[PDB]
Amino acid sequence: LTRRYFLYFKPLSQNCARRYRISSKPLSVRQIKGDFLGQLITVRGIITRVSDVKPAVEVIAYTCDQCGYEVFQEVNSRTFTPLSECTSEECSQNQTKGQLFMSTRASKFSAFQECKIQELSQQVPVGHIPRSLNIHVNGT
Amino acid sequence: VFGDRVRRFQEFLDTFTSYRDSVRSIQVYNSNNAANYILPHRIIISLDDLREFDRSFWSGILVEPAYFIPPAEKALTDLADSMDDVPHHPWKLSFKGSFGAHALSPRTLTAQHLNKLVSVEGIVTKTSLVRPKLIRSVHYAAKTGRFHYRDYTDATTTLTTRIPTPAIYPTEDTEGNKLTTEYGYSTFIDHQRITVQEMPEMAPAGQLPRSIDVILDDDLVDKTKPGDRVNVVGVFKSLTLILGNTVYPLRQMLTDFDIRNINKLSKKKDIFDILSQSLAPSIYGHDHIKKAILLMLMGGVEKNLENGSHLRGDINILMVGDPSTAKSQLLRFVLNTASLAIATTGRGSSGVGLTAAVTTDRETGERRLEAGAMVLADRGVVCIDEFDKMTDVDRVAIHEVMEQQTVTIAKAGIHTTLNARCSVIAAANPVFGQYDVNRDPHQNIALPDSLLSRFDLLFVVTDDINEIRDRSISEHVLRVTIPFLRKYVQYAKERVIPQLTQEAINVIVKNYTDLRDDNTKKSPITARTLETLIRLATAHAKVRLSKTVNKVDAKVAANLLRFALL
Amino acid sequence: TEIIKSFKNFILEFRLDSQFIYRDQLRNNILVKNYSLTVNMEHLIGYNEDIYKKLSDEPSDIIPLFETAITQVAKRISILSRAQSANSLPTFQLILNSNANQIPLRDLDSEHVSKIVRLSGIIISTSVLSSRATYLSIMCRNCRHTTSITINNFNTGNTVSLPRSCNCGPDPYIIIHESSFIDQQFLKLQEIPELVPVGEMPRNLTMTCDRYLTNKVIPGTRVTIVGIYSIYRTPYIKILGIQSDTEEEEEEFLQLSRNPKLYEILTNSIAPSIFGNEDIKKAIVCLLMGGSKKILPDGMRLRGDINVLLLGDPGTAKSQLLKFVEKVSPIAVYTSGKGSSAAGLTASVQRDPMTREFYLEGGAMVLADGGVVCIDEFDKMRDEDRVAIHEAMEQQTISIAKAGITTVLNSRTSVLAAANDFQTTILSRFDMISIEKMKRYITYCRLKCAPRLSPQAAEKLSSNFVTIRKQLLINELESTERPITIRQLEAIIRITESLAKLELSPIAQERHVDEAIRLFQASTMDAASSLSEIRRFEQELKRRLPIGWSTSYQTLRREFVDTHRFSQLALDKALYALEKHETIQLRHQGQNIYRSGV
Secondary structure: OOOOOOOOOOOOOOHHHHOOOOOOOEEOOOOOOOOOEOEOOEEOOEEEEEOOOEEEEEEEEEEOOOOOOOEEEEOOOOOOOOOOOOOOOOOOOOOOOOOOEEEEEEEEEEEEEEEEEEOOOOOOOOOOOOOEEEEEEOOO | OOHHHHHHHHHHHHHOOOOHHHHHHHHHHHHHHHHHOOOOOEEEEEOHHHHOOOHHHHHHHHHOHHHHHHHHHHHHHHHHHHOOOOOOOOOEEEEEOOOOOOEOOOOOOOOOOOOOEEEEEEEEEEEOOOEEEEOEEEEEEOOOOEEEEEEOOOOOOOOOOOOOOOOOOOOOOOOOOOOEEOOOOOOEEEEEEEEEEOOOOOOOOOOOOOOEEEEEOOOOOOOOOOOOEEEEEEEEEOOOEEOOOEEEEOOOOOOOOHHHHHHHOOOOOOHHHHHHHOOOOOOOOOHHHHHHHHHHHHOOOOOEOOOOOEOOOOOOEEEEEOOOOOOOOHHHHHHHHOOOEEEEOOOOOOOOOOOOOOOOOOOOOOOOOOOOOOOOOOOOEEEEEOHHHOOHHHHHHHHHOOOOOEEEOOOOOOOOEEEOOOEEEEEOOOOOOOOOOOOOOOOOOOOOHHHHHHOOEEEEEOOOOOOOHHHOHHHHHHOOOHHHHHHHHHHHHHOOOOEOOOOOOHHHHHHHHHHOOHHHHOOOOOOHHHHHHHHHHHHHHHHOOOOEOOHHHHHHHHHHHHHHHO | OHHHHHHHHHHHHOOOOOOOOOHHHHHHHHOOOOOOOEEEHHHHHHHOHHHHHHHHHOHHHHHHHHHHHHHHHHHHHHHHHHOOOOOOOOOOOOEEEOOOOOOOOOOOOOOOOOOEEEEEEEEEEEOOOEEEOOEEEEEEOOOOOEEEEEOOOOOOOOOOOOOOOOOOOOOOEEEEHHHOOEEEEEEEEEOOOOOOOOOOOOOEEEEEEOHHHOOOOOOOOEEEEEEEEEEOOOEEEEEEEEEEOOHHHHHHHHHHHOOOOHHHHHHOOOOOOOOOOHHHHHHHHOOOOOOOOOOOOOOOOOOOOOEEEEEOOOOOOOOOHHHHHHHHOOOOOEOOOOOEOOEOOOOEEEEOOOOOOEEEEEOOOOOOOOEEEEOOOOOOOOHHHHHHHHHHHHHOEEEOOOOOOOOEEEOOEEEEEEEOOHHHHHHOOOOEOOOHHHHHHHHHHHHHOOOOOOHHHHHHHHHHHHHHHHHOHHHHHOOOOOOOOHHHHHHHHHHHHHHHHOOOOOOOOHHHHHHHHHHHHHHHHHHHOOHHHHHHHHHHHHHHOOOOOOOOHHHHHHHHHHHOOOOHHHHHHHHHHHHHOOOHHHHHHHHHHHHHOO
16 A cells, blocks of 8 residues: 555566576467466567556555544456445444445556557467467556 | 265275376475476376276266265375375366267257266367356454355265255454455366257257256366367256266268279279269259369368468359259258258358357356357358358358368357368359350359359359250250268268379469460459369369379369369 | 066067068167167057067066066177177167057047057257166265175166165265266157147147167157156156058049049139139139159159249139138148248247257248249248258258258248249249048049159140241340240150049149149249340449449439439349349449449
């Protein structure tokens, strides 16, 4: 919530891989095998489809006038539901369950963008077509 | 009941070291690839060593694989742990060989022998999208920095049905703290759902095809594509589907009396004319057209070049003329007398054509495919009547599959190609309704010039009223056999491949250079026609089943050219 | 137990033509693993009177006892056959067919319920191959106890129900599915529509089909079903067996066949109030059987049936003679153009009211196997049925390409249509543009004889063809553009075969061909009543407006209007020829200028 920065990674090259004697190989989209879901991969390809930069929320901030304790919920999927019921630490021990409002300023957003990477022309096999894959980027 | 079966499989593996050295080779290949930094952990078991070694174990595998397959894979995992001595996953099995009565057609596959393993061959119609599934999900607690994990089971991970445990995905901790989804330490196993029906040559053609569904694991997801003949081996489980563990991608009987008859009819030089005249006695005339139809249904050679593209062996025939004759009556004869043939009307296909139909789904995986008509017949013949009514989409499709014999489909999920080495028989009608010699021979077809270049032989049948020739048609229609030419055509297709000689190269070079005359007088001659001028020769040379070609084959091809061009 | 020994003695002791018929059939079915056998009711009534009457009275309690005796002898057959060369045996379902009686659907009453019943009809629907169980392992979720339950012949208040208790409370049971399932079908059957009263539509019946006879019956044929008339009030049929396809009458038919003016009185009898039209009446009465069906040894057989088409103003029995051909003929059903009210001529597909099953609603083109079809209002045809009737009128085969089933079927139908791109299907696909004793003679003639033709009467046909081709060529080279084919000559041959077949003779003479040419001349009189057009069109496009803009249906309307050669049919005919000759410029103009208009 108080993250001023954005954390990102980058892999090692082949020159640092031959030195001291893999993790970063140029992978095709036909060379994905299914079982690489969760490994860091370096894919090479042309980009045909790109989208506009859009703000996607990460955490939804709700404010109340009755208690003052602003709550924050975390979303993970593409969609979500509005938490109209109060889950604060003061409304649990109370008969009243007063209305909550949303804040578009205290909520943390991210510059989300989808892209379609395509398979390289000479890396595709004989007869096959260059199928695509989706890349979801965020931040800077 | 588990210990006795695991010691019997250990004794069978100690007797036969062919699987032990194979799994040691699997492990040393994995170690060499790990040292450089994979194979999908399965060993095919020859069933012929299981019948003579143990009869009861063989019978138990054939009647109860749910109680016989997991102790054998437990023995295989124990052998993989005992054969390896380095530090630090399951292992599966596979079978092959003859099955007897268990090997059957899917149309004859009924409610009997459920639990028993079924070997069934056929043609695949659809191959769904590859979908990953969760069998284990991990999570992290940031309040203390711990890691938690949960496992998932279903009715497709074991042969026996386990007690159903509907494990809810953890959106909360047991203490009540927040948590996140550790994407990456949780394994993913992909599955596929393919459909397979019976082959059109072995099935009693006239009926409906019956298809079945195969659920596929991670290992064998890259070896399936539509349009190929396949043989699957699985278990007919009914929660009705088959749990396919072994896939192998891959007709009149001949006696010794019929081979004497076709060897006796191989050296007489009057065989071709009477064999061309004996195919349809209900149709008067048109001898050279059925001579080309005889050369058409027997085939070519299908030459595959070294390190390059393949060469077309198939021939294509287009037939035009007035609609009074038997062009629509010849398709029924060529459909009922060939080895395998598919006939379509040319207009009325529910998909986008006779290839790459509609794609939609309503089940769990929201992707499904469909097979067309040209992707089913891979070596036979297809017949399209009313060629002028066929739209441009199928015309673009047959422009591409004519001399390349491959079809490429760029869908949202499917980006593969498949073989279409078939021969087309097109029958068309003019747009004016009638045609005579005094009209020009180019605008009467009302087809583009590229389609005239795609089709090899264009046969024009005239029907102007003439009192001399029209006197005997009434008494002829008012007035060698069928099971012999089928055996003749398939024995020529399977045994003899003809090669070229110097006696038949020069005469076809002379004929091609003499016609390249027709360009100034009546018809365009292309480079593709060079190829079609020797295909037919080879044809005639294999009609006589000689090991090489002759000069008379090029002469009868030039005679067929003079009849179909002038 | 005594009935067990009696049925085992009936299986291993019945003799016919000095051989057992059930032992070798059981060995052949066990060797291919079919798990079924064909028994006949006539053999068991000829063998034992203590079996058939008890089977007819109480089949539900004696039939699974016979079934378990069949499995008891099958186990012995399997263990003695497996030991010769190269465990778990299911309950062998028996099928049993007979032809001792054929009761109609209207004779079904409140009596003889749950007894044996055999009747004929037309299967309209085989909807969903559903699943049931035959042996299932059940377990509990509380005290970790499991067991199993078996059923053999009982496949809404019946036999199969889960136990409420084995404390675990109500329903603690879980089905262990992979250690356990059979197929079954729900079918619909209706009575023959040729014999159904005019005041009410034909009723139907529902039936349950099990394991060994699944997917054996295509919907739309003459099917004889034998089973149990049970009650679920509503009746239903449990199928246990399946099969399919007065001397004074023949004396008076032979006396009527000796009359020389028979054709003439037949024609004076088919038209009681129709004034005139003898050539239409003879062509209607000669288009029933068709022609000479000949099975050549090369496999390319010839079609025997023909086509007849009525055309004219409303009235003059265009739909009244069709009722007489619906009630006279062996197999025929009355329908109309684009189907009818809650019925269809072609393959009509609808939705099921229960469980949303996609299934075919009905069809009269499958139900007319081996006869004629008769429709009204030929101008009102849908595009999804026109291609099917377009192929069936010349090839007599109906091909379906659905994802569930892809069946081609022998239609074997002739058409007797009435009416008021359509020009080629009217002028090319059509060749012509007591009562119980008569129907019996028509059926005996359609099954018994296979005629031929003599060359002495065929030379007149050859001379007629030479003269009509030499005479209509004057009208055809004069750019009238209306024809003459060999298909019409083959239809003339089929007409002569039908006319020579009506006197029950295998030979033909000049007596039938002199009436056949007179029948054909009225059709030719009704049918009778490119350089220039392409010079016009092509020169127009080419040298007038290459963009084509400003030159469309207006401008041709002007030129041709001002050249006095335009007929809209002629205009659109030359044009469709140009798009169709793939003038791809004519393609292009059609795409634009056409509904761009000018």
